[PDB]
Design a protein around this ligand. Structure first.
Ligand SMILES: [Ca+2]
Lengths: 408, 147, 204, 50, 146, 147
């Protein structure tokens, strides 16, 4: 099953991962425990965190998402070469032997001149790359675009450049064939992957036992689906650390809304969800046609832009089984207050829309001149700015003990 | 049309000067149209050892002839003198920048000497420094490496 | 030697016929070398000074942000212009703007006890004033709009707000030996080294 | 001049580090185990007329 | 010949206009004003076809410290005029003459909210920043290196 | 021109008899191999160089050459890479390929010479540490395992 865990702090999510491992002993024939991660930092944080609450951490693989998906392709599907022949690198080279021929086409007239005036394979190589770089990207965001261009078809609504990219892509694919290389990209292979998994409703061909996804606040639409289908024969524990407990994303059809009015189960107890019966969906939340016209908290509003997308795509899955793991934030600090707002999706900002509201000031929260969490410092220069910090780090170290330096 | 930021006495003096001849900026395409001084500033005035001083004051050297040499050794001296003159008379509350019925003693931070080149600056800095009046050349480019 | 072999093998893989001019390789060896980052000491001998890495939002008791100036933090770079995908966006898409802004949020979210925010207020030359990264502006602005100091309970929204932002904002001195750094109270320096000069206790 | 500088009453005490059979091998590997985490750190030197 | 005494709020926001900001005439107060008008498409006959976004109002100064201050002054004016839209009441010059020209204080407040959070991308560069920017975008035409 | 020597060198090491009954790299299939294992052994309660030298002595005849305790108190973790860990369907092992010497020829790679460089580089520690890790790991994985 593709289990999706929404938590407040990476700790609780690390906790659930800690427990998932103690529970099912997992096999042990040197079978590497798997954790998809997107930054060495995490890998190190997990490694150490886990070596503690266990006495050691040994195998664990930290494949990047993209490298995982393709790992499976090789497993599920029939005869897939390890490492695509369309990887960003090789692409740049193959594109360098091609472009020169593709010039003087009317199509590539724009590049045709850009590459003439002068060079020594300098302009040709940057292009061959920025190109290969783009293709590598289109192969994840808009993987249908290629299947289109491969047959010469264009796509209604794209800027120019498709004028040359489209042919170029068809051109790269044909060339790579003559070279005699596995035609398989990442786009012509995701659909099949799902189909053969979504069907063959029998059993897991021989993939891994359980898989985790830690600290990745974003994944491509296609990688999720790919994982979804995979989460039918494999246990996929995707640990997503979410800044708000309620749903703060946008909405599609006022028909898709009630399909969201479902519920997330506590990993151990049972069911929860967004506040105010209907009124919520109603009111302004997901107003007019747009998305959450209020997104409650204004900070989570203008910043979490990346979050919305990922949360919205997670709640558009079917084989999913999301569940709550949000821990509270008692509002004693300015930090905790703000942190709390963001959690409960509430705005405590006061604009003073009316003389009643605007004249008094005790409606807002009491500060506490003594509160030092969340401080602001204006300095004259980087040196100065660093000398000052060293002082305050010293201070706040003195302040409360227990605070070792690694905590900063 | 409105010149916020400045004193009426000033705007009047500047306008008068640049209204003398026609095409003061001598270029029919760059005409000079006077400007109305802002009301919120109508109160601005500068008093010294007695009464309010003119927005603009011209100091004229004597004689018939005058070399670029003289008109510097002597002008810097003069300028220098008038600065300490405002400053000292400032600590004694006799040099005041006033907005109607408000006031304050002029401080070094209030005086400013515009100049055309490094030298000129030095020329000034020296006559000043000769009167223990500390200064700083805001347009200094020298590097810490030839100190 | 690794990168060099890499760069070459890769080119051989895609079967490149024509020859290669050194420049090509040097310029690439350079770039790679420019991107290869060293961060092996990330979580051993404490106090980690680093950059805001996307997809690495670990929780720390203390979180300090330095150089959060306008034009400096929300790190930029404009899409190629011929990156079709950037003109016609979709839910899955990603860009630095978005990544960084959501990073600043991950900080606040991850700061368990103290959030330290710092930026440069003026260049030590023309002395002109600089500005805090909009992101930081959006934070104190929210603080001030939802808080009030004990004293000021009946005065005004804007007025109570100011006093709050002004109260959390701390204007530091140009030199470390400035006496203000040695009176009593808010961040008295822990550097006695400068004390004597701060107290004009010199002997010409 | 009525000043003075805060003086911290805490002490260094313990030191948390993450060693690795490096508590052995004396330095020189400074930044070495950093640039190449899997470098054959166990070897080093020059060669001649052999 | 001889220019019209400029009245910011009534300046026709449509093609070619030369403004002479004499010595300390509030050239900055003017620019900001004109900036807001544009954002909210205000004015009237002397207004602009439609409303523009922060990333559509190109402003070029010569100095680096210039664009910083210009960019700073604007985020502020926006945050205010926007607030002064939620209160539908302002008691500070400029702004009031602006709200009188606004037809839906509730919308401008929204429109403005975006302009606020958009400022970290305001099209306010230097002559030089504008150039290498257009250049590096239209690389093919300029024959520039990426 | 190193291929012959090398292609012949590799094999010679592969089909090389490890300890006794069978065991030779060439007999190890994928499923029984785990290359480059990275472990993390938490270490609380300061690890004193001296305190460890004592027990290391009693059990190891190699660490009898007691210069040790060349490091100082450390609390925290313990990184470490294991070149290879495999299983001869019965037990698990620790392999560490070590390319060293310039020490002329053969005579320097004798059971004596080797056990010499061992203390020379104090690799002995690597042993105890590494195994202590594989211990912790195997015990962790193999639900109910014995040394
Ligand atoms: Ca080894």
């Amino acid at each position: 099953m593709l289990r999706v865990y929404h938590s407040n702090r990476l700790d609780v999510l690390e906790a659930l991962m800690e427990f998932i491992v103690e529970r099912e002993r997992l096999d042990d024939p040197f079978e590497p425990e798997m954790i998809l991660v997107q930054s060495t930092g995490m890998a190190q944080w997990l490694q150490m965190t886990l070596s503690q609450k266990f006495g050691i951490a040994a195998n664990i693989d930290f494949p990047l998402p993209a490298s995982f998906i393709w790992d499976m392709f090789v497993r599920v599907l029939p005869e897939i070469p390890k490492e695509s022949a369309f990887n960003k690198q090789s692409m740049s080279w193959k594109l360098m032997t091609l472009l020169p021929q593709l010039l003087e086409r009317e199509d590539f007239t724009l590049l045709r001149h850009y590459l003439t005036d002068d060079s020594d394979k300098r302009k040709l190589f940057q292009l061959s790359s920025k190109a290969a770089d783009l293709f590598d990207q289109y192969l994840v965001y808009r993987p249908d675009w290629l299947a289109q261009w491969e047959t010469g078809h264009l796509v209604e609504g794209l800027g120019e450049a498709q004028a040359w990219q489209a042919p170029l892509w068809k051109a790269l694919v044909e060339y790579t064939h003559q070279l005699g290389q596995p035609r398989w990209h990442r786009a012509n292979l995701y659909q099949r992957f799902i189909e053969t998994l979504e069907s063959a409703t029998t059993c897991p061909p021989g993939l891994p036992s359980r898989v985790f996804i830690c600290g990745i606040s974003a994944l491509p639409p296609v990688y999720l689906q790919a994982l979804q289908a995979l989460g039918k024969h494999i246990e996929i524990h995707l640990l997503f650390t979410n800044p708000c407990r309620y749903y703060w994303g946008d909405i599609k059809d006022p028909a898709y809304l009630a399909k969201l009015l479902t519920r997330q189960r506590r990993h151990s107890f049972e069911d929860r969800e967004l506040p105010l019966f209907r009124d919520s969906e109603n009111a302004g939340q997901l107003f007019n046609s747009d998305g959450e016209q209020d997104v409650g908290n204004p900070l989570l509003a203008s910043w979490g832009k990346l979050g919305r997308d990922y949360i919205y795509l997670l709640s558009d899955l079917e084989s999913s089984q999301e569940l709550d793991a949000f821990v509270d934030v008692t509002p004693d600090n300015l930090l905790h207050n703000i942190q709390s707002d963001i959690l409960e999706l509430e705005n405590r900002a006061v604009a003073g829309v009316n003389i009643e509201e605007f004249s008094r000031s005790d409606n807002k929260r009491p500060l506490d001149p003594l509160d030092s969490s969340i401080t602001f410092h204006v300095c004259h220069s980087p040196q100065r700015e660093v000398e000052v910090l060293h002082d305050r780090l010293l201070a706040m170290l003195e302040e409360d003990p227990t605070l070792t330096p690694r905590d900063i | 049309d409105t010149n916020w930021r400045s004193a009426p006495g000033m705007v009047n003096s500047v306008n008068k000067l640049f209204s003398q001849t026609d095409d003061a900026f001598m270029f029919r395409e760059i005409p000079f149209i006077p400007v109305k001084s802002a009301g919120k500033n109508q109160a601005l005035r500068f008093v010294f050892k007695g009464e309010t001083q003119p927005a603009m004051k011209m100091w004229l050297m004597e004689g018939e002839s005058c070399g670029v040499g003289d008109y510097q050794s002597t002008m810097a001296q003069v300028c220098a003198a008038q600065i300490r003159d405002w400053l000292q008379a400032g600590q004694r509350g006799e040099a005041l920048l006033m907005n109607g019925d408000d006031a304050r003693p002029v401080r070094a931070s209030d005086i400013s000497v515009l100049v055309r080149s490094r030298q000129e600056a030095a020329q000034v800095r020296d006559a000043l420094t000769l009167l223990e009046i500390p200064s700083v050349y805001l347009s200094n480019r020298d590097s810490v490496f030839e100190t | 030697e690794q990168q060099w072999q890499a760069i070459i093998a890769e080119g051989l893989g895609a079967q490149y016929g024509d020859a290669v001019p050194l420049s090509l390789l040097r310029d690439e060896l350079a770039q790679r070398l420019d991107q290869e980052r060293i961060s092996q000491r990330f979580l051993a001998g404490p106090v980690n000074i680093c950059t805001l890495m996307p997809m690495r939002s670990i929780p720390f008791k203390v979180v300090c942000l330095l150089g959060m100036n306008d034009g400096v933090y929300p790190r930029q770079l404009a899409p190629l212009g011929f990156d079709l995908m950037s003109q016609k966006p979709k839910r899955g898409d990603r860009s630095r703007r978005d990544d960084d802004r959501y990073l600043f949020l991950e900080a606040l979210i991850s700061a368990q006890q103290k959030l330290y925010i710092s930026y440069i207020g003026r260049s030590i030359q023309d002395n002109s004033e600089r500005f805090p990264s909009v992101l930081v502006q959006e934070l104190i602005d929210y603080i001030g709009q939802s808080h009030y100091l004990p004293g000021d309970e009946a005065l005004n929204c804007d007025e109570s707000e100011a006093r709050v932002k002004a109260h959390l904002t701390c204007l530091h001195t140009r030199m470390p030996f400035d006496p203000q750094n040695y009176q009593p109270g808010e961040r008295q320096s822990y550097a006695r080294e400068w004390l004597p000069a701060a107290s004009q206790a010199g002997k010409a | 001049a009525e000043l003075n500088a805060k003086t911290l009453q805490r002490l260094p005490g313990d030191n948390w580090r993450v060693t690795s059979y490096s508590g052995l091998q004396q330095r020189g590997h400074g930044i070495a185990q950093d640039l190449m985490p899997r470098l054959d750190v166990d070897a080093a030197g020059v060669a001649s007329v052999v | 010949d001889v220019a019209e005494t400029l009245d910011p709020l009534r300046l026709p926001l449509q093609g070619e206009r030369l403004i002479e900001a004499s010595a300390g005439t509030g050239k900055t107060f003017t620019i900001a004003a004109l900036y807001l008008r544009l954002l909210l498409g205000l004015g009237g006959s002397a207004a602009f076809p439609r409303p523009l976004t922060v990333e559509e109002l190109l402003v070029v100064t010569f100095t680096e410290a210039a664009t910083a201050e210009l960019r700073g002054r604007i985020r502020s004016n926006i945050h205010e005029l926007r607030i002064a839209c939620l209160r539908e009441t302002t008691d500070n010059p400029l702004y009031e003459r602006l709200l009188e020209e606004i037809d839906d204080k509730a919308q401008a407040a929204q429109w403005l909210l975006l302009a606020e959070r958009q400022m970290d991308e305001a099209a306010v560069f230097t002559i030089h920043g504008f150039c290498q920017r257009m250049l590096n975008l239209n690389a093919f035409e300029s024959g520039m290196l990426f | 021109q190193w291929e012959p020597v090398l292609t012949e060198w590799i094999t010679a090491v592969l089909q090389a008899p490890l300890n006794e009954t069978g065991v030779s790299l060439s007999q190890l299939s994928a499923r029984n191999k785990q290359v480059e294992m990275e472990f993390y052994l938490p270490i609380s309660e300061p690890l004193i160089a001296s305190q460890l030298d004592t027990l290391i002595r009693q059990f190891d005849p190699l660490s009898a050459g007691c210069p040790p305790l060349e490091f100082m108190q450390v609390r925290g973790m313990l990184k470490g890479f294991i070149d290879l860990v495999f299983r001869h369907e019965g037990r698990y092992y620790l392999l560490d390929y070590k390319s060293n010497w310039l020490g002329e020829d053969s005579s320097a790679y004798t059971q004596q010479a080797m056990a010499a460089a061992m203390q020379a580089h104090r690799y002995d520690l690597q042993y105890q540490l590494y195994t202590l890790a594989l211990h912790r790991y195997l015990r962790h994985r193999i639900a109910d395992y014995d040394y």
